[PDB]
């Protein structure tokens, strides 16, 4: 037999409430939601709406099911269609350099789709803003919600949008007949995080009943191998999950009943 052993979580993930929201956020005030303690289908996200971008830097859409993560993070905002490229690792410009920067080692998916139908207004939608000027670049996942006037000259400037200084925020403006490059686009960045802690988010792979004293194919919280598992009088810190040695996985921690089981080939 083969065993795959996942935590006993019985909650679905709040993904349909991040994509089907009414008013998304501005790229400078991009919203973040935490996803923890839930089983994620990732099926109502691969087929939710006709998508312009579903680029999964890092893990691959075939593999997210049967992977377990510690925390998932759904970032949400709305940018211009030309700027969906800038939501990617290692990119330069305005949106990535001053509004929303991703790390060179990013892991997760970037989804992006057209919202001209419900984010554009004939009179003009001035509810969405972007930061044009910042005194410095952004680190991965930083956020500058400031609204202070910025001066580029040696002369001071405070509380007035006079010459040599300029307000930092700029309104997009979304009229239904804008070019497709300049039309609204809603972006949801799913970012997955593995850490030295229990796995809270896990794909819908049903846990199997545990079997020791036999040579099985094991899959614990996603980490896979082969061998026989035997009850282990070893013990490591709580919130620790594996027994790397000399980098094999000597021992594992059972997600459901936190017993340490040693792996031997």
């Amino acid at each position, epitope marked *: 037999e083969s065993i795959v052993r996942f935590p006993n979580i019985t*909650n679905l993930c709040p993904f349909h*409430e991040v994509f089907n*929201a009414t008013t998304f956020a501005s790229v400078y005030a991009w*919203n*973040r*939601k*935490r996803i*923890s*303690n839930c089983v994620a289908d990732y099926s109502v996200i691969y087929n939710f709406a006709p998508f312009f971008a579903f680029k999964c830097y890092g893990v691959s859409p075939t593999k997210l099911n049967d992977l377990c993560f*510690t*925390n998932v*993070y759904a970032d949400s905002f709305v940018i211009r269609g030309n700027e969906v490229s800038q939501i990617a690792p290692g990119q330069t410009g305005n949106i990535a350099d001053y509004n929303y920067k991703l*790390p060179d080692d990013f892991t997760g998916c970037v989804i992006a789709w057209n919202s001209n139908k419900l984010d554009s207004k004939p009179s003009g939608n001035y509810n969405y803003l972007y930061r044009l000027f910042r005194k410095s670049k952004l*680190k*991965p*996942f*930083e*956020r500058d*919600i400031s609204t202070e006037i910025y001066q580029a000259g040696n002369k001071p400037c405070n509380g007035v949008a006079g010459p040599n200084c300029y307000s930092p925020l700029q309104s997009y403006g979304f009229r239904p007949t804008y070019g497709v490059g300049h039309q609204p686009y809603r972006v949801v960045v799913l970012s997955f*995080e593995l*850490l*030295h*802690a229990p796995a809270t988010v896990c794909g819908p792979k049903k846990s199997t009943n545990l079997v020791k004293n036999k040579c099985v194919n094991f899959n614990f919280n996603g980490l896979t191998g082969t061998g026989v598992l035997t009850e282990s009088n070893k013990k490591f810190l709580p919130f620790q999950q594996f027994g790397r040695d000399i980098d094999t996985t000597d021992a594992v921690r059972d997600p459901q009943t936190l017993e340490i089981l040693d792996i031997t080939p």
Partner: antibody
Framework: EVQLVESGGGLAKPGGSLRLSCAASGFTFSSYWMNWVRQAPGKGLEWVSVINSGGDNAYYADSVKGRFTTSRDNSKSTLSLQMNSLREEDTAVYYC?????????????????????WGQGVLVTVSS | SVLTQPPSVSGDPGQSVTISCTGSSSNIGGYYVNWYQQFPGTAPKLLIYDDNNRPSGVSDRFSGSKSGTSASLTITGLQPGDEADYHCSGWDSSLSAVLFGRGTRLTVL
């Protein structure tokens, strides 16, 4: 286990400075995120501040933003809150709460804080 | 940017009790809600986190349930040793801070 002991409060005069402290023991203090909460007499809890695991981005609440200053020493395991320019509405029990979850970037923005372990509470009263 | 919970909730022993918390969409409606328990003159204790979860050190008779713009905490079996105030917490996406209600004084008869 996770033990949070608080210290350094009492009476103070409007326009005076107090300085709290929170000694933690039983976890990797140089890893987690720490919060300051307060509770007025009989009337509700109120969140006050949050700090990183590296002491570079402190986020305050709009009722104390500008007078308080949070810090943490990773050498020791001491969290700290310096309270300058106290008012009468600052009379409360001050608790030192720990974030429940681990964060990978430590300089990025995270939203939904949960406090698993608290401390006894230091009472701070502002009067004459 | 304000959360609403009843200031006083009662119940006869043996039966069950329910505490409410009504917010908004930048609030309870669209983020995680926690519940804390505080006995008189003590510190709070994480009773429910992420709207349904009971940590390992909490009794199974403490259920949480968030549905829409409202949240509720139900105590099934009122052992008189839990007359303590119950605080409701959330995340206001507009102000980017942790919210708190007024607390509910639980009274047994």
């Amino acid at each position: 286990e996770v033990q949070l002991v608080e210290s350094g409060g009492g009476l103070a005069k409007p326009g005076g400075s107090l300085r709290l402290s929170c000694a933690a023991s039983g976890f990797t203090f140089s890893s987690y995120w720490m919060n300051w909460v307060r509770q007025a007499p009989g009337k509700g809890l109120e969140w006050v501040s949050v700090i990183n695991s590296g002491g570079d981005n402190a986020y305050y609440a709009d009722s104390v933003k500008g007078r308080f200053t949070t810090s943490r020493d990773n050498s020791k395991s001491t969290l700290s809150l310096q309270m300058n320019s106290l008012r009468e509405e600052d009379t409360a029990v001050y608790y030192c709460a720990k974030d429940r979850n681990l964060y990978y970037y430590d300089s990025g923005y995270y939203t939904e804080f949960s406090f698993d372990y608290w401390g006894q509470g230091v009472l701070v009263t502002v009067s004459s | 940017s304000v959360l609403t919970q009843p200031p006083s909730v009662s119940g006869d022993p043996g039966q069950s009790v329910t505490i409410s918390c009504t917010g908004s969409s930048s609030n309870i409606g669209g983020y995680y809600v926690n519940w804390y328990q505080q006995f008189p003159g003590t510190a709070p204790k994480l009773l429910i986190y992420d709207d349904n979860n009971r940590p390992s050190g909490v009794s199974d008779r403490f259920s949480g349930s968030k549905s829409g713009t409202s949240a509720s905490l139900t105590i099934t079996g009122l052992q008189p040793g839990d007359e303590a105030d119950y605080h409701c917490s959330g995340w206001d996406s507009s102000l980017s801070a942790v919210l708190f209600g007024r607390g509910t004084r639980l009274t047994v008869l």
